[PDB]
Design an enzyme around this catalytic site. Structure first.
Site, mmCIF file in Angstrom:
data_model
loop_
_atom_site.group_PDB
_atom_site.id
_atom_site.type_symbol
_atom_site.label_atom_id
_atom_site.label_comp_id
_atom_site.label_asym_id
_atom_site.label_seq_id
_atom_site.Cartn_x
_atom_site.Cartn_y
_atom_site.Cartn_z
ATOM 1 N N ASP A 6 -9.547 -10.133 8.607
ATOM 2 C CA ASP A 6 -9.033 -8.604 8.391
ATOM 3 C C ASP A 6 -10.094 -7.612 8.321
ATOM 4 O O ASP A 6 -9.820 -6.568 9.046
ATOM 5 C CB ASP A 6 -8.495 -8.535 6.680
ATOM 6 N N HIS A 33 -11.224 -2.736 11.231
ATOM 7 C CA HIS A 33 -10.019 -3.733 10.707
ATOM 8 C C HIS A 33 -9.981 -4.607 11.685
ATOM 9 O O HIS A 33 -8.740 -4.602 12.371
ATOM 10 C CB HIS A 33 -8.861 -2.683 10.591
ATOM 11 N N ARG A 50 2.128 -11.981 -0.477
ATOM 12 C CA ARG A 50 0.789 -12.408 -0.129
ATOM 13 C C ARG A 50 0.595 -13.343 -0.704
ATOM 14 O O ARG A 50 1.052 -13.976 -1.702
ATOM 15 C CB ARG A 50 -0.039 -11.387 -0.319
ATOM 16 N N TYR A 81 -1.165 -3.458 -7.145
ATOM 17 C CA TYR A 81 -0.951 -4.588 -6.036
ATOM 18 C C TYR A 81 -1.936 -4.283 -4.915
ATOM 19 O O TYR A 81 -2.156 -2.943 -4.528
ATOM 20 C CB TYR A 81 0.501 -4.210 -5.509
ATOM 21 N N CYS A 105 0.638 -7.711 12.326
ATOM 22 C CA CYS A 105 0.758 -7.645 13.709
ATOM 23 C C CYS A 105 0.175 -9.038 14.284
ATOM 24 O O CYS A 105 0.025 -8.976 15.621
ATOM 25 C CB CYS A 105 0.070 -6.413 14.467
ATOM 26 N N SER A 131 -1.637 -3.802 10.869
ATOM 27 C CA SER A 131 -1.235 -4.606 9.782
ATOM 28 C C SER A 131 0.373 -5.156 10.079
ATOM 29 O O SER A 131 0.923 -4.595 10.787
ATOM 30 C CB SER A 131 -1.086 -3.448 8.287
ATOM 31 N N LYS A 142 -9.774 -2.505 0.962
ATOM 32 C CA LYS A 142 -9.332 -1.417 2.010
ATOM 33 C C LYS A 142 -10.110 -0.162 1.405
ATOM 34 O O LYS A 142 -10.680 0.435 2.446
ATOM 35 C CB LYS A 142 -7.852 -1.207 1.853
ATOM 36 N N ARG A 189 0.865 -1.288 -0.033
ATOM 37 C CA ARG A 189 -0.047 0.010 -0.007
ATOM 38 C C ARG A 189 0.731 1.241 -0.107
ATOM 39 O O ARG A 189 2.041 1.241 0.494
ATOM 40 C CB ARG A 189 -0.767 0.119 1.337
HETATM 41 N N1 LIG Z 1 5.895 -13.212 18.412
HETATM 42 C C1 LIG Z 1 4.830 -13.570 17.918
HETATM 43 N N2 LIG Z 1 4.616 -13.073 16.569
HETATM 44 C C2 LIG Z 1 3.529 -13.355 15.665
HETATM 45 C C3 LIG Z 1 2.383 -13.962 16.314
HETATM 46 N N3 LIG Z 1 1.451 -14.078 15.656
HETATM 47 C C4 LIG Z 1 1.821 -13.641 14.329
HETATM 48 N N4 LIG Z 1 3.142 -13.189 14.568
HETATM 49 C C5 LIG Z 1 3.950 -12.635 13.444
HETATM 50 O O1 LIG Z 1 3.311 -11.302 12.878
HETATM 51 C C6 LIG Z 1 3.227 -11.371 11.457
HETATM 52 C C7 LIG Z 1 1.997 -10.843 11.153
HETATM 53 O O2 LIG Z 1 1.299 -11.717 10.477
HETATM 54 P P1 LIG Z 1 -0.226 -11.527 9.997
HETATM 55 O O3 LIG Z 1 -1.255 -12.294 11.103
HETATM 56 O O4 LIG Z 1 -0.585 -11.859 8.700
HETATM 57 O O5 LIG Z 1 -0.356 -9.924 10.292
HETATM 58 P P2 LIG Z 1 -1.915 -9.232 9.926
HETATM 59 O O6 LIG Z 1 -2.516 -8.587 11.359
HETATM 60 O O7 LIG Z 1 -2.922 -9.942 9.412
HETATM 61 O O8 LIG Z 1 -1.721 -7.830 9.118
HETATM 62 P P3 LIG Z 1 -2.322 -7.916 7.427
HETATM 63 O O9 LIG Z 1 -2.532 -9.202 7.039
HETATM 64 O O10 LIG Z 1 -1.655 -6.798 6.791
HETATM 65 O O11 LIG Z 1 -3.922 -7.094 7.815
HETATM 66 C C8 LIG Z 1 3.431 -12.722 11.142
HETATM 67 O O12 LIG Z 1 4.429 -12.920 9.943
HETATM 68 C C9 LIG Z 1 4.154 -13.401 12.194
HETATM 69 O O13 LIG Z 1 5.487 -13.818 11.865
HETATM 70 C C10 LIG Z 1 2.634 -14.217 17.794
HETATM 71 O O14 LIG Z 1 1.637 -14.798 18.384
HETATM 72 N N5 LIG Z 1 3.803 -13.969 18.458
HETATM 73 O O1 LIG Z 2 -2.461 -3.615 4.958
HETATM 74 C C1 LIG Z 2 -3.156 -4.405 5.452
HETATM 75 O O2 LIG Z 2 -3.587 -4.370 6.780
HETATM 76 C C2 LIG Z 2 -3.571 -5.622 4.498
HETATM 77 O O3 LIG Z 2 -4.526 -6.462 4.880
HETATM 78 C C3 LIG Z 2 -2.624 -5.776 3.255
HETATM 79 S S1 LIG Z 2 -3.628 -4.691 1.792
HETATM 80 O O4 LIG Z 2 -4.839 -5.405 1.395
HETATM 81 O O5 LIG Z 2 -3.915 -3.189 2.446
HETATM 82 O O6 LIG Z 2 -2.415 -4.689 0.748
HETATM 83 MN MN LIG Z 3 -3.872 -10.871 7.599
HETATM 84 MN MN LIG Z 4 -5.368 -5.618 6.850
#
Ligand SMILES: Nc1nc2c(ncn2[C@@H]2O[C@H](COP(=O)(O)OP(=O)(O)OP(=O)(O)O)[C@@H](O)[C@H]2O)c(=O)[nH]1
Ligand SMILES: O=C(O)C(=O)CS(=O)(=O)O
Ligand SMILES: [Mn+2]
Ligand SMILES: [Mn+2]
Ligand SMILES: [Mn+2]
Length: 620
Positions: A309, A262, A403, A233, A286, A284, A242, A85
């Site tokens: 999401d 979100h 992704r 992308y 996290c 994001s 989004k 983004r």
């Molecule tokens: N230490 C730790 N790291 C974590 C944990 N869960 C996820 N992670 C890390 O945080 C990163 C975030 O992954 P996602 O769950 O896809 O992040 P998201 O909140 O979905 O963000 P978006 O997909 O962009 O919306 C991952 O690559 C993991 O390596 C956790 O419970 N503990």
């Molecule tokens: O940015 C985020 O939290 C996403 O889920 C990825 S995108 O759909 O914004 O590219």
């Molecule tokens: Mn996600």
């Molecule tokens: Mn997201």
């Protein structure tokens, strides 16, 4: 009518019929066709035959490769300048600036980027006239949410990218049936173009058409229009994710009285046969997708996924806050996904999945950092830069924001009510982010007003989602900082107003932190499946168990209230340590942030909670 033949694009339609489209739908198609000048017009029907032709077309054009190791999995490598983004080039167009962002007290608004109609009209006329020269304009009719749900919204996206069309078939509900449900009703107008009209003036990198210099993602909530240009992308091109389901949806939610957040949605069941649903707003990158697909380590506990999401929430006639997942698939980060971290994701992405910017193995498989899986002898790795990669290089083989795009129905733990039009009743809301120090593992808000203050005071170190760098603790209230659709002060007042509704069943509000480190830079909490121990305490608190202890910041679990069996090495003192010196500086940063960014639009109830927290900390 016409005097010649310069307005009837019926002779350029290669699938569908403009005559069968609704009148307002045809005006939106033919109007932009005369402006962008596409060579062909393709009206999508969502069939498997159409999806197969686009995959074969993109493979012949060198856009995507076939992953022969899996069943119908494809790899796409993009331009290195078009990988995430672009928050800096995302703008909202309203007549008055106060409708979009609270007028800052001194600094610049971090809660949104406003642009007048006069300025946007010039930026629009310098990009779109003739941008689809020699390309095909695809018409994508999609529905956000279950086709028939009361909170279902229908959209029409015009685009010149078959990669967008294929991804939209996975992430949304698209096809001919969406046009039948629309009729003469209202829809959201979405216009997207990669910005590379033929003949090409610039050669394309990795056969990925993009225009980074003229990238613009504009929103016009008063016109129900989304206009994106230059990027193909994820969040920039998939306009239903989004741009629609968060920014424009939050504006509509404020007007109509619901919520667009979100947040993930998961259902959790305990060994006693009771099931509850939780929502969690993390920034994001996290941990939302990992939490929503968690394989719990506690026996007798089960986690089911509704969404990962976006959540659309609204009270019902009974006072229950009900939520739906408006999406149709998962667009999750690939690096870090392993059999140990997210085994349910590995089972899902093994078929009908489009990968973007991940590494390809010589035998036809995928590879990325943190996959935790050794390869067979003789297997070579090709990085996302389309180069030979060995573990001795400095650069990673997969982009950090790479992704996968997989259908949600293939998830083995998908919740049986994820397509229910009535939604699932939310009994708990979870906030949190990446905090290496200070913030305890979990604590519970004291009231609804304190919980809204907790979401507004969210902070997290900068990841690799937008375009920020460096180890910097930044503010991200409600994990909605890049997605706010209107004034944030009115956003807070909308959340606080939920406590005024009759017979309302307000959920509990928790704050978590999986990322607290010690003095060695090592994580104190194992996380991932072990986070089921934290969700166990939340489950009991919602039932009303007496397992909480009062602190100056909220309710924390009592001594021996958490099931820490098996993890006997956890440092409970450092996991829940509350330092007064840390929290005196923390409230100072929250005070300076809310005073400058929200200013006169800050609700008094939020300022009262800031006063109360600072007083309880001073008495320590
Ligand atoms: N230490 C730790 N790291 C974590 C944990 N869960 C996820 N992670 C890390 O945080 C990163 C975030 O992954 P996602 O769950 O896809 O992040 P998201 O909140 O979905 O963000 P978006 O997909 O962009 O919306 C991952 O690559 C993991 O390596 C956790 O419970 N503990
Ligand atoms: O940015 C985020 O939290 C996403 O889920 C990825 S995108 O759909 O914004 O590219
Ligand atoms: Mn996600
Ligand atoms: Mn997201
Ligand atoms: Mn060709």
């Amino acid at each position: 009518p016409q005097l010649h033949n310069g307005l009837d694009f019926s002779a350029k339609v290669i699938q569908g019929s403009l005559d069968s489209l609704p009148q307002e739908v045809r005006k939106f198609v033919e109007g932009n066709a005369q402006l962008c000048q596409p060579e062909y017009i393709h009206i999508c029907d969502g069939s498997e035959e159409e999806y197969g032709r686009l995959l074969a077309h993109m493979q012949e054009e060198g856009v995507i490769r076939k992953l022969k190791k899996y069943d119908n999995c494809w790899l796409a490598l993009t331009d290195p300048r078009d990988v995430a983004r672009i928050e800096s080039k995302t703008v909202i167009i309203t007549q008055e600036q106060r409708d979009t962002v609270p007028i800052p007290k001194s600094g610049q608004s971090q809660l949104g980027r406003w642009m007048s109609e006069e300025d946007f009209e010039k930026a629009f006329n310098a990009r779109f006239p003739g941008c689809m020269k020699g390309r095909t304009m695809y018409v994508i009719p999609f529905s956000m949410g279950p086709l028939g749900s009361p909170l279902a919204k229908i959209g029409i996206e015009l685009t010149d990218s078959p990669y967008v069309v294929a991804s939209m078939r996975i992430m949304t509900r698209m096809g001919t049936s969406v046009l039948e449900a629309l009729g003469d009703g209202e829809f959201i107008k979405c216009l997207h173009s990669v910005g590379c009209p033929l003949p090409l003036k610039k050669p394309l990198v990795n056969n990925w058409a993009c225009n980074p210099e003229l990238t613009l993602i504009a929103h016009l909530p008063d016109r129900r229009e989304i206009i994106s240009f230059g990027s193909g992308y994820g969040g920039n091109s998939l306009l239903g994710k989004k741009c629609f389901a968060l920014r424009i949806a939050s504006r509509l939610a404020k007007e109509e009285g619901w919520l667009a957040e979100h947040m993930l949605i998961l259902g959790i069941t305990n060994p006693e046969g009771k099931k509850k649903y939780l929502a969690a707003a993390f920034p994001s990158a996290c941990g939302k997708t990992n939490l929503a697909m968690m394989n719990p380590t506690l026996p007798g506990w089960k986690v089911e996924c509704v969404g990962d999401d976006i959540a659309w929430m609204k009270f019902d006639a009974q006072g229950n806050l009900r939520a739906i997942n408006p999406e149709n698939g998962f667009f999750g980060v690939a690096p870090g996904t392993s059999v140990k971290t997210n085994p349910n994701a590995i089972k899902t992405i093994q078929k009908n999945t489009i990968f973007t910017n991940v590494a390809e193995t010589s035998d036809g498989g995928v590879y990325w950092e943190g996959i935790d899986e050794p390869l067979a002898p003789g297997v070579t790795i090709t990085s996302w830069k389309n180069k030979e990669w060995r573990p001795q290089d400095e650069e990673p083989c997969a982009h950090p924001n790479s992704r996968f795009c997989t259908p949600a129905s293939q998830c083995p733990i998908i919740d049986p009510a994820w397509e229910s039009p009535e939604g699932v009743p939310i009994e708990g809301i979870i906030f949190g982010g990446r905090r290496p120090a200070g913030v305890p593992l979990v604590y519970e808000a004291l009231s609804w007003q304190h919980g809204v203050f907790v979401g507004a005071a969210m902070r997290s170190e900068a990841t690799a989602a937008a375009e920020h760098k460096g180890k910097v603790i930044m503010h991200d209230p409600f994990a909605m900082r890049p997605f706010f659709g209107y004034n944030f002060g009115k956003y807070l007042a909308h959340w606080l107003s939920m406590a005024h509704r009759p017979a309302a069943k307000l959920p509990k509000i928790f704050h978590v932190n999986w990322f607290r480190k010690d003095k060695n830079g090592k994580f104190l909490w194992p996380g991932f499946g072990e986070n089921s121990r934290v969700l166990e305490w939340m489950f009991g608190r919602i039932e009303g168990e007496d397992s909480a202890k009062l602190t100056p910041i909220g309710y924390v679990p009592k001594e021996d209230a958490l099931n820490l069996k098996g993890l006997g090495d956890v440092n409970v003192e450092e996991l829940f340590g509350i330092s007064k010196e840390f929290w005196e500086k923390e409230v100072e940063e929250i005070d300076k942030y809310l005073e400058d960014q929200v200013n006169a639009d800050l609700p008094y109830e939020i300022e009262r909670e800031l006063r109360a927290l600072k007083q309880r900390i001073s008495q320590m």
